[PDB]
């Protein structure tokens, strides 16, 4: 497998030597996913998992990396006989992709915690026989590249990974598990999930990677965590530098989440002469609008979290409103629980905490407060409108009474005189999409909000207590 030109940079003695390797591979016809994932996993093992003995950087010797490479390629070539699966015309078959998926799956440790850190790379697969969910999909794509199957590529939503292949790259196959206690669907298409308009499959507006984007995925998959309180500065630096390399070559253009990740790293440690974090967050949103029909949630969540961290209440509320405007056109389905948890935490923890602090600061005489800005009240209302509209037509409900007390409290953080300025109109001015918010319009301007009436309108509950 390893060609002479792939070996000339070893040993890798620094962050910068690893970046040089990535640069060299990204300059080749096709970057070697197996080589690159092994190198990252090796470096991550000795910078985050076991730093005993570390003095600067874990030197990656060719003999060591080549031996791991050979273990991988021997395992895949011996287990997958290509003669059994004839390939017409640069196109792999569903049976072949399933075989490769089975070889990876069947190699894993019988029992292990699937939620651990540092089990994403081919280094983990070879040395520990352990992979996380998305790691299995990446490993299938790396195995397929090692086999010469140029048409097999990684597909990514915001919470899941699978593969595309076949004539025109138009076929889809599940190759790993999703979540905890869901039933395998390995071998099947993603068409039911697309048709049901779940967030998990993005209404079909998911990422179809080329090889360079598969390199970007492995970079985003670097985990600098040493423990709950400490990150590896070395791995943060490596991730940041590799992301800029990919950015400069054009390979983040269609990868919103990578752009957000890069923006986050720039906020932590700015690189002189590069774009500000805000510019990068906006670029991520633009990517989602340009390539994915503005059907992604996380570009707006990335932006909102940045404003939240910086206590920009107005801009945080606007970005969460924008978040909800995306989700409103989805149906909440069985395996979408991660995005429900995110909306729940924003509505019922994050926004309440932000508004509580804003209330204290207003008491102390703050000027230009979000709490005195009717446009901010309108953003709060748009946030809840999008969540209510999301619920419409969904097979599983979203709202319940455990949301209602937080809604009443948040509404109440704006005085009646501020709330009155927003004009709610039918199809500061706001239009509601959801039937639940339309029915609540009446209640939104009283000096003291009617808590019980709000609760009734937000929830399926239609009666009050009997006695």
């Amino acid at each position: 497998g390893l060609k002479a030109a792939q070996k000339t940079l070893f040993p890798l003695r620094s962050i910068d030597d690893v970046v040089r390797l990535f640069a060299a591979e990204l300059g080749r016809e096709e970057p070697d996913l197996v080589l690159l994932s092994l190198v990252l996993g090796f470096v991550e093992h000795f910078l985050a998992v076991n730093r005993v003995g570390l003095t600067y950087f874990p030197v990656a010797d060719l003999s060591i990396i080549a031996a791991l490479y050979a273990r991988f390629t021997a395992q895949i070539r011996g287990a997958v006989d290509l003669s059994l699966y004839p390939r017409e015309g640069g196109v792999s078959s569903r049976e072949l992709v399933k075989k490769v998926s089975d070889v990876i799956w069947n190699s894993l440790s019988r029992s292990y915690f699937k939620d651990r850190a540092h089990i994403q790379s081919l280094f983990s697969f070879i040395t520990g026989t352990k992979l996380d969910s998305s790691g299995v999909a990446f490993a299938v794509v790396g195995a397929c590249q090692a086999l010469g199957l140029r048409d097999v590529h990684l597909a990514l939503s915001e919470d899941h990974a699978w593969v595309v292949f076949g004539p025109n790259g138009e076929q889809t196959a599940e190759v790993t598990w999703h979540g905890k206690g869901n039933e395998d669907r390995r071998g099947q298409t993603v068409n039911a999930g697309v048709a049901e308009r779940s967030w998990l499959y993005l209404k079909g507006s998911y990422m179809r990677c080329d090889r360079k984007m598969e390199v970007a995925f492995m970079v985003c998959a670097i985990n600098p965590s040493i423990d709950l309180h400490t990150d590896s500065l070395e791995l943060l630096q490596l991730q940041q530098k590799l992301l800029w390399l990919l950015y400069d070559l054009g390979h983040l253009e269609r990868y919103p989440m990578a752009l957000g990740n890069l923006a986050d790293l720039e906020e932590l440690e700015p690189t002189p002469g590069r774009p500000d974090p805000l510019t990068l967050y906006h670029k991520g949103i633009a990517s989602a609008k340009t390539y994915y029909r503005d059907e992604h949630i996380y570009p707006y969540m990335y932006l909102a979290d940045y404003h939240c961290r910086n206590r920009n209440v107005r801009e945080a509320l606007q970005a969460w409103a924008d978040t909800a405007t995306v989700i409103q056109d989805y149906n909440y389905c069985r395996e979408d629980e991660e995005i429900y948890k995110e909306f729940f935490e924003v509505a019922n923890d994050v926004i309440p905490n932000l508004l509580k602090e804003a209330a204290s600061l207003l008491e102390a005489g703050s000027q230009g407060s979000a709490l005195q800005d009717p446009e901010c009240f309108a953003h709060l209302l748009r946030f809840y409108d999008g969540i209510c509209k999301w619920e419409e037509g969904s097979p599983t409900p979203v709202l319940h009474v455990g949301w209602a007390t937080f809604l009443v409290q948040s509404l109440g953080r704006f005085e009646g005189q501020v709330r009155q300025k927003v004009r709610i109109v039918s199809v500061p001015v706001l239009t509601f999409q959801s039937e639940k918010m339309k029915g609540m319009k009446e209640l939104l301007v009283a000096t003291k909000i009617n808590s019980s009436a709000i609760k009734l309108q937000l929830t399926a509950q239609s009666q009050v207590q009997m006695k």
Binding site: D115, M257, D264, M301
Partner: peptide, 10 residues
């Protein structure tokens, strides 16, 4: 623990 690569937040 484990988070999906490049998901926002902590």
């Amino acid at each position: 623990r484990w988070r999906f690569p490049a998901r926002p937040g902590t």
